[model samples]
Target: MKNTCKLLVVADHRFYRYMGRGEESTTTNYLIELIDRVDDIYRNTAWDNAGFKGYGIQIEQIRILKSPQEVKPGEKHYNMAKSYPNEEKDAWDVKMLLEQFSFDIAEEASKVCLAHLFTYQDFDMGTLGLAYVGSPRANSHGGVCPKAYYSPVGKKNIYLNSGLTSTKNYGKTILTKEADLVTTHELGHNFGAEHDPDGLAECAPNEDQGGKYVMYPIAVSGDHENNKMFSQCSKQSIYKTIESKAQECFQERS
Candidate 1:
């Protein structure tokens, strides 16, 4: 229960098949980088706590789902989101999304965290990415982990929006770091960490930065959110939810 866990990448086939190899590679590369960032942040937390080298969270597998010839039906959480039309923001139903888009079969176990990355973010999936909090604690858990709370991995999957990396509208150089922000940020939630700001982005627009943090709601290259560090409380969440549950990892280094 110290620090270490395994993650599974469940990617949509169209992300690469339709967009071409560049799109495929870009997403793959960015996700890998995000995992490393997760490791680094937790490792630093460990180092500060006990000179423990790492959290040991690793991406055990990358499962590319077949091109979607059909869309799945939504049953669990009918809408799969709570929307604030007036505010123009959306909250994804992480538990439902995970259960709806699941590819787990009888052969596979049901006890590993899954991250679902989509190829198309248009039409309905809003925002970059989101994970379920599974408790009302999150409404107040923003900006800080509770003194004590319930959080766990593998119980649900996270769905990432298509705007995650770059967009077709802009000629942006595709600074992969942005993709890392969406990913690592959401994973933090999946690991039981909470957002700095429940529904808004913090730590950007203001240069005054440094010392103590990693679970920002959002991040950029030079924002306060970009400190690239995790809080000590977050380490406990990882151990309690992820590390403690990661009985063993089969696939490695995807």
Candidate 2:
């Protein structure tokens, strides 16, 4: 439905190696539980927000690419910096990794759903995750509107209906916990919210006033009230994007 996010989640072999220590079923189960927690977080965050009546995510499917071959085939080569840390030379580009899912989903890419891939690789920029902001095609009918807009008030095409999350943070002791936060935050971008304007008093207040929300450029850690909610700017951006004609992929649950 328009209020629900139909999601297709995929995991790479490297991620399985880290999380399940190479056990296929183990990794699959772990991802399932983790995604469930993500679902809970979104459900709770929308509890007080004023966009859709009941905005939350629903898993359309979950796949663990146990074989390295499964992870390698769909990758498209790009003349960019190496994607992995010094350990290995070639790795999938973050953007191409998401594009891979477009092929995996085939015809379903044209449906009302979003594809998100989890990996254990490091990008050259040392990013925790990456998503297309205001992607017209991510949730739209596949490649039909495949453009990604970076500005808060612009429209652009996305190469595919997908996003990527890396289970990497500078010095996070627990990658599991960090993954949950990154997943939720990246999806915020996919949902059309830009980074929270920290300098704008309307979107953020002093540190003592629970200043950071989910869309903050660098997340504010700890059990703060604002951590779980989208800032006012974020809500308005998402609302505006959703109301725009480019993003009509949000379906009515039948």
Candidate 3:
């Protein structure tokens, strides 16, 4: 079924402190725009099949994790960080961050279909983002969501429906306009879209078609026409994966 994927996105302390340049309001605003752009990409998918258009992305919530010291006395838009002082100072470990998210997010607030983490920290791999395929961490057992993919009723209490992204490339801050492309691309992995295929066949775009698709393994500046969209193979694969593996966790948006 076509449904809105309710996503709860959390930005880490460093994201606000560093890449955000310590401007919470401005940083939050840019992040919101990034998510909006991702949603717009999904909304552009229009299939002709009956009872199916394309899945949508809804920003269920945006949590900016900040320390008490960072926020001004009356600052209203931050979530108090816990254990920020204890975390390692090196690159952010993908596994550790996802695990922390599972433990940190409140049970009541973790009701959404997906949880996404945005950090200014880099991963040792020099990659932009990481996500589990068909995340079993999503809330898939509630009335609005159901058991899907790797998520069963028994796993609802665990928050693996999550992924991590960063705005850093070789320690330099990437502009949000470019940074969010990685965000959406990571989300695609969670949605079961693989990297575009190896050759100029199947999932890859033809040379004349302009440029690479969104799932291209390497980074494309998204300057070409095709870079802004998903390839047919990716779309079909994603749809099939959702139906066969994730139907239980989705609710049609009214």
Candidate 4:
């Protein structure tokens, strides 16, 4: 059977607006480029791989939503800053900003899907999913949902978060190129990719292998360089899920 899987790209305008301010300007552009690159890689992988044929993995759509508020830093916590001493004071502010931003993105992404996809019941009502792209906490201490949850209106949904985009935590200059790999890796998780015990165990062959793939919990500044593409295992898992979902759709159609 021919693969006919499709992926919709929803660009949260709010995310772009918030990340475009100050030094984050460069980082935001880099993220956009990375998302496009990852999408391309996903498409090619699905098209070229035979295993995906049975799954009908053809990407039919990519939608970028204009949600600027979704990615912006949230209101500051004045109380925390006042309580902390000199050095720790500023750190608290930064932490507050990051945490608020993360939560806002997740919430907004969920709302976007609820308003659009779930309303239309566009994909298989049985296997629909969602994935959001944004830097994870610099501390590697967070994640979004893996499996699709039922929306208020009863549609399946999922979410993913790229690692951090700022430079403070890593003690190195902020990297824009890493955003693509990070996004792809998070998407992999939604597709069932798990971390490998060894640092280099899950790195993609064609891309850089600084250590392990993004699935692993490494503190290295350039962890994104370690894995640029999906591993064979990940590819298989994604294809299988898509295939299974597509089968259910066929059943409904028949």
Candidate 5:
């Protein structure tokens, strides 16, 4: 029998800071829109082999929390020393900021499980993952990565990078396009999906890159014509993970 699973998402306030000026509100709206669109896609796609139809995965809710200090606002500058304070002073503070954001996001996600999902009792297999669109540590290029680190509280947590949300190459006008693609790609990583090196072909083989697919990394350049659905490979991997862990959460009482 196939088991049902629930995935919860929580927002970190740091996402707002990265939005720069008045763009913060716009960023928030765009992020939520992207989340809803991606969730819809996941729900519509079903894994027939696993007897899964993507019905019970609920997003539940998304909330923001307060934090001290915010990212200084400015254009998307590649030169770290001029853009970030710590970089200019030659200090390792970028890691500190990134950790703070990651921990905050993870803590919020954990709380959602405890209070709403009753994760401890109801879902013993619950897992929390943090997603971000930018890095405190400046990089010449934008990208995401999956890595685990020991938290200050001594608990292990996974941190996934979602690249920067700046408008350096595309300008501030392309906010929606940039946010959607990056957020979708990052969430894919959270679900154990690897980067599609084949570009748009990875999302849909026949279509060219930058079509309607979320896996297309460069949607900002007008590659939105590709199919937006997940490829068969992606569906298989997600269903497999759910199958392996589903029974741990759902079992009938005899």
Candidate 6:
């Protein structure tokens, strides 16, 4: 059931401008390495059966929401995400966090999104970048789509706190590679892939495999030397989403 899967990339233009003025993030736009990396991962990987020929990802559109951002420290939305600073927040919290913003457009099926913010909220740990695999927004009937999802889906878009991504922490470069990793991981969420357990790998579970695929959340804070590709079960999850939830364009192979 795989076909040429098209994606919508939404970036915060204001953040793009900020990255342009800095040395670390100047090359991060359009995800130079991230795109190619995922391109290879999705195209070469298969599960369920050799019948899984894999999806050919296509960039249907890229948008820039160019607007200046400001810090509303007193706001409830700002304070809501501060509980887990400089660390991973619960996926439900991430989804709840995304609901507070009115910054980007979304589409069902292949709606993978990313954003750059001037400053999201700040904590003693520092301002943080945000990305959730699937959010209700993208799964809600969007654009010229159907009224209900044939199968439920969540987490397609990723949100990056631009200000934090453009800087270095303890002299370590931030954002670009992080963006590459999270972008791929969150997009995998778009396909219904869930987080995998640490260290294990490659389709190691049943019903829903949680292998050491990049879907493993720890890949973010750990040595990324080996984190790559969709795990066997992750690939099957993608195949299942295509079979049950995708649009007509995906009903037949490309």
Q: Which candidate tops TM-score?
A: 3
Q: lDDT tens string, model 1, 2-78?
A: 34545555555534443335465665765566668756665556533565444545665655544443425432321
What ranges in model 1 sit over 4 Å off? 1-3, 17-30, 71-99, 102-126, 133-174, 197-206, 218-226, 232-254
Clash pairs, candidate 1, are 203-224, 213-229
Each model's lDDT comes to 0.42, 0.61, 0.64, 0.36, 0.38, 0.43
Comparing candidate 1 with candidate 6, which one achieves the higher lDDT? 6
Report RMSD (Å) for each prediction in the order shown: 8.6, 6.0, 6.3, 11.8, 11.5, 8.4
Ranking of all candidate structures by their TM-score, best first = 3, 2, 6, 1, 5, 4
Cα lDDT tens digits for candidate 2, 1-254:
46566777777776777766799888888778877877777665543364453555677777777656522533332222234223253455566555544445434444545777777665555567777676332444322123342323213223455677777544332456667777778877877778888789767766688757878888556357677577888877766655552345554433
The per-residue C-alpha lDDT of model 1 at residue 16 equals 47
Candidate 3 C-alpha error for residue 207, in Å:
5.5
Minimal lDDT window, size 10, model 1: 160-169
Error of 2 at 247 (Å): 8.4
TM-score of each: 0.55, 0.73, 0.75, 0.44, 0.52, 0.56
How far in Å is the alpha carbon of 142 misplaced in model 5?
20
Tens-digit lDDT track for model 6 on 114-134?
232222222224323344333
Model 3, backbone clash pairs (residues 3+ apart or across chains), number: 5
**Residue 188 of candidate 1: its Cα lDDT?**
65
Identify the candidate with maximal lDDT: 3
| Per-residue lDDT of model 4, residues 1-254, tens digit only | 32332332333332333343323444345444555565566655642266353321222233333332222243332222221124332232333333333343344433221111100111212211223321222222123222233334323332323122222222223344444444455455544455444534444332343544444434233444455555555555555544443332211100
Lowest-sum lDDT 10-residue window in model 2: 76-85
Candidate 3: residue 220 Cα off by (Å): 2.2
Global fold similarity of model 3 (TM-score): 0.75
Model 3, span 41-86: residue lDDT tens: 8766652234555676777788776642244543222233322333
Off by over 4 Å in 2: 46-51, 70-108, 135-159, 170-174, 244-247, 251-254
Q: Residue 178 deviation, candidate 4, in Å?
A: 2.1
